[PDB]
């Protein structure tokens, strides 16, 4: 299975946030650790994306674009999976050194978002998502959010996305077509559910960036730039998710 072989081969390892668990939880400490984790994971997302079949055939400006728009969804989905596989969705496993119980969900001031992410995590159990389905789905999330006015080379993006949809379909395909159809429906619905969550997190981090000096939250280099230049394009509707089903 050439494609799946590649996805498993390139899958990033464990990333720690660097969080001090010996200190009492505070809003500022938790969010500063999340922001650092974001920066660390972004580095891994770039190295991963570059190794995905067909990715480097995109225009370099489109490579930049998809990474800068898709990262929240990619990272949320992966965290949901870690949470499912490591703690049966009981807590949010952001990193081995940054695990959110309900108290931290409250302290973070992102409780509503956390609950939705935990629901997402539970869906991996409820649907019995396989590791191989997870890998293909995550890859597809990189190609699930683009500018409304299209990319630099839309045709190449369209072919790439089409081929990642095909690979997911093949992983699903089960003698009975009705089971394959129900499965594809379930998984595309799950994929779609990532985007509203990512949007709420995008809103939160944008607002937090705008007031970060007031609340003592540190944003690293790339994250602060992405959140001020790219994220508002999502928030203003210039960049939108590609949904399977209508919202």
């Amino acid at each position: 299975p050439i494609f799946l072989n590649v996805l498993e081969a390139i899958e990033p390892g464990v990333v720690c946030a660097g969080h001090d668990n010996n200190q009492p939880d505070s809003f500022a400490a938790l969010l500063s650790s999340l922001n650092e984790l974001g920066e660390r994971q972004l580095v891994h997302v770039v190295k991963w994306a570059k190794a995905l079949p067909g990715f480097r055939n995109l225009h370099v400006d489109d490579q930049m674009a998809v990474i800068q728009y898709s990262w929240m969804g990619l990272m949320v989905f992966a965290m949901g999976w870690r949470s499912f596989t490591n703690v049966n969705s009981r807590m949010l496993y952001f990193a081995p050194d940054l695990v959110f119980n309900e108290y931290r969900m409250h302290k973070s001031r992102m409780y509503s978002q956390c609950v939705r992410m935990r629901h997402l995590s539970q869906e991996f159990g409820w649907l019995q998502i396989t590791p191989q389905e997870f890998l293909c789905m995550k890859a597809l999330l990189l190609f699930s959010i683009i500018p409304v006015d299209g990319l630099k080379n839309q045709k190449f993006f369209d072919e790439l996305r089409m081929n990642y949809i095909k690979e997911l379909d093949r992983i699903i395909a089960r003698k009975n077509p009705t089971s394959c159809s129900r499965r594809f429906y379930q998984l595309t619905k799950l994929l779609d559910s990532v985007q509203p969550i990512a949007r709420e997190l995008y809103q939160f981090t944008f607002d937090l960036l705008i007031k970060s000096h007031m609340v003592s939250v540190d944003f690293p280099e790339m994250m602060a730039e992405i959140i001020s230049v790219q994220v508002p394009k999502i928030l203003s509707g210039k960049v939108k998710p590609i949904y399977f089903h209508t919202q």
Partner: peptide, 13 residues
């Protein structure tokens, strides 16, 4: 243009 991100994308490592 995000210079730091483009560097990561351009970098072989």
């Amino acid at each position: 243009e995000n210079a730091l991100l483009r560097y990561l994308l351009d970098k072989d490592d």
